[PDB]
Amino acid sequence: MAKIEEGKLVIWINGDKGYNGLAEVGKKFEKDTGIKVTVEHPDKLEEKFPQVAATGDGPDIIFWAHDRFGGYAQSGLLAEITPDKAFQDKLYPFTWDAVRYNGKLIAYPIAVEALSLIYNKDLLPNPPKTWEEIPALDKELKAKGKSALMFNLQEPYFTWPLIAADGGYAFKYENGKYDIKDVGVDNAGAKAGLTFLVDLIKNKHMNADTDYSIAEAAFNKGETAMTINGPWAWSNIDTSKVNYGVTVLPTFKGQPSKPFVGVLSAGINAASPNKELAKEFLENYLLTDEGLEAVNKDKPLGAVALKSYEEELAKDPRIAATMENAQKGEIMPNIPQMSAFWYAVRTAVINAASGRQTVDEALKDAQTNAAAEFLYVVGRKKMMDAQYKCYDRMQQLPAYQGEGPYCNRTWDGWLCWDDTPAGVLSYQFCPDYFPDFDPSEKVTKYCDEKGVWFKHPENNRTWSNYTMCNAFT
């Protein structure tokens, strides 16, 4: 396919969500209009979408949590959606706020997602209120052939409540805008959260390999007392007939766990030629009591954005927990910088869990990565400011007055050097561009007997010796 088929809807949604429910709504749409809706669930659709979106294998509509949609907008991959005020009043104002980017709506919200603590009531009538009291619990449970707690370690969505509990954050939220120069991935509290998790692994209470489906199997087969997961999971648990509760997440250092809250949302592809059909599907078929029930029946959405349908669902205690955990947490930012933050934290947790890096090492890399935008400007500007002084002083100092050869004034890339006489070894303090450079130590540059700067014997390149700058640590 060179282009997206005009006159059908192709829809993309994650494989843990109610995709067969959605296809049912799609079947009703085809009954009324005559146009086929195809629902799909590719792997890593959130990563595939930018690459394929305008290509012709791209979907007409994409479902994902709201955090990825700012980056999608910046890349111009999404249509602006145009619901009138009457439709807007059908959803809660806070949900519309998650899908607003630079003043425009960029997706239709569907549901508010937050992880909760799930537990096996038969094994555990009384769930722990606190993370610190878990290892104790796992010791008892191992004696009885069980594990206390198994959940996805591979994805940082699941480990972020712990990290944020004692003071970790993504980007500082001041003035009603997120400040990307200030990142809370390497602070005291984050270090503390991740350390607790790594210690659970050192003391055998969890296994670093644990991923989404291992942990699901363990809970649903009654091998583990507890799990951490969202409303989508509840279907498969029902099926198993494990007797289960959904409750508040455990406190760490007396502060509650703070999940990042996702608003599952639907965007329309900018390259779709079926945009009004898409709008009609989403507004008149999907976001209805009828429609959301088809989806929630297959796999639960949690707390929905549609006020009418949330009023059916609000009596359910699993929803109340979900909202309680949401309230303790934070609504995700949608800025483009979120893709970098998740990569950072994902990478850190895996490396540390895995044994590859200490916690302080793993996280310092996350801070470097999560805040790449800002650190490139500063690093870059340090250097440029030095270049310009060099250039000014190269223009200002009068000509060499010396009857012999001399190497002339130059900017070497890191430091300024003056006209220097033949056979003279010139020196000055190391620059402070890099964290491993001691500016009490010095740099040499030798001018040869013929008035030419020293060249490296490895490649005859003009070269100043910065070896003392970082040689002692």
Binding site: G413, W414, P435, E458, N459, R461, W463, S464, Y466
Partner: peptide
């Protein structure tokens, strides 16, 4: 702590 290089090919 990634280690800064000072060899030929730097300044």
């Amino acid at each position: 702590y990634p280690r800064t290089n000072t060899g030929s090919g730097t300044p």
